[PDB]
Design a protein around this ligand. Sequence first.
Ligand code: FE
Lengths: 172, 172, 172, 172
Amino acid sequence: PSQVRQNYHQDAEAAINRQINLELYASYVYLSMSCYFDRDDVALKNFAKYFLHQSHEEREHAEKLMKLQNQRGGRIFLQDIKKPDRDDWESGLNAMECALHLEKSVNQSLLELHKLATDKNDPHLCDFIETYYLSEQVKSIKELGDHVTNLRKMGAPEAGMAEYLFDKHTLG
Amino acid sequence: PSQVRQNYHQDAEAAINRQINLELYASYVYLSMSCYFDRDDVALKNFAKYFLHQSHEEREHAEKLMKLQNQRGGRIFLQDIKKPDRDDWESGLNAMECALHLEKSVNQSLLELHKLATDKNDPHLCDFIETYYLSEQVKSIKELGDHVTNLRKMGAPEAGMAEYLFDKHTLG
Amino acid sequence: PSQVRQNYHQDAEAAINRQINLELYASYVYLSMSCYFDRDDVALKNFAKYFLHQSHEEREHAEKLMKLQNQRGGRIFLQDIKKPDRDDWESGLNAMECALHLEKSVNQSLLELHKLATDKNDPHLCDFIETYYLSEQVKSIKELGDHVTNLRKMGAPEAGMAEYLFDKHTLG
Amino acid sequence: PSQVRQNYHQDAEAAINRQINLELYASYVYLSMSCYFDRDDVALKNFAKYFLHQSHEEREHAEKLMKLQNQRGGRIFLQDIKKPDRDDWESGLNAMECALHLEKSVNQSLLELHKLATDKNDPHLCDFIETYYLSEQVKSIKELGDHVTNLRKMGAPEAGMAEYLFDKHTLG
Ligand SMILES: [Fe+3]
């Protein structure tokens, strides 16, 4: 094997590659949302900025996983990055709800990866996931839930002023 | 002819003079809008500021065309600057819609001018129009479309708060 | 159509979407190269840094195309980002050769897109491609050719010192 | 027992003392390497500097373990620090290979210590080992593997220029 490989199960390496592809897919979905809100018939600049920042953060998460895989002596295997489920995200509120669902799915995959690391007795991988991924997932889920709650209370998307003022005040 | 004239067709010179008059007319229309929003019974300061800035930008575009005409050895012929079609612009949303229409008409005239430059094999004129006028027209049209979309979603002009809050948050 | 759409053919919109997917694919390929050179059994840090920078530049090119598509009133349609052709790039020289091939293919697609813009009489699109994409492609192709020539003269990859010293002196 | 002792098994205390002695031994071995490369007939200053820094880092690791042992109410028991296996390390490449082996052995002992902490339900000890020792071991192993790979590709130690240029460019 690799000269640096030590206590790194092949199942963990495969699951790291799968998580890499999932993070890249999440980056792609956020890019799709960000480009939806830049349309002339949507025109919510701070929503688009927020989702572009989320896309870049997901890219950084994938790159950190790739660095971890090379650090442990595993070999990175890249797969296709699937296109997002839709191109029209229909509202700021619907995009925030879908982002919340996506982040919860990514968190569930990370929890499965941590369970795999625990079952294989890989404390370094468990420490990596706990330190760099689980807490960030919890904060992201809480922030998206806060956003969805506020937009819902404002009357979005029926109340046309709601998404505009949320764009100005919360995301601006 | 002029001692500096070279590869400058008379049709291009005439079309440059026509474009000069069109830019001056657009400046006049924007000045009319800006003075409409400064009325005591309208009182939207940031709308008036936005349209005054647009008027000054259109005048700068006309001056740049005049400089181009003198640079190529053509002779500037000024015509009457027609008064705008109306004095009462009736709302912020209606003024933005009419501005979008005016910018699209100016862009169509610029595209015709570029086609004329291409048919006459004047690469300097084509480069001038592409570099300094077409891209700015595209950005201006996109910005006006964004403004119209946002005002429409806010419920303007029926929702009285819409134009006020758009004046404060987007134009302010 | 879009309220901002003007002189934007549907063929141009489709070709812009295809170019978007091509730029994203090129970013993915460069990311694959960058992760190959971070392996413990390759260990060329400046090669990996160079290819990571190339990946980020390709993503920026894709984002600029997306902004152009929204600016002209076209609608962005995202497709799958295909996985790179290989995971093992076998040497610094082979990776540079494949990068040169990839950049030439991207340039050929850009030239086809410019020919389409010229045939449809879209001077704004032609100006966009010429200003922001063709010159950068020419610089990138020249730089990659220089790199390949230097590595070949050094005796890479048979001469083991060649890629190391190229990593230190040229890429470092 | 100690007035501060709480949830600290005697097996954990014994294993902490053993790890202390192992870290001190690793510091001694690195000091031996550093003094080997300062010889007039070897004369690789940056190799010696690198190994002296490694020796000081291992001593700091031992001191941190000693502080942990006093913090939990355990009692430090020091043993003999055995002399290194050899005095002549024969090359930069051989010294790097032996350093890689030594760091992997230290990492294996740390993994055993973490398994002991997990079996005894000592979350503070597991957190201490994961935060301060396992990640650093992974970085050190990866760095040493990178060094060995680069020296091997350069042709060390047969190619006399290889260790000199690695000393100047990588370690300098
Ligand atoms: Fe040198």
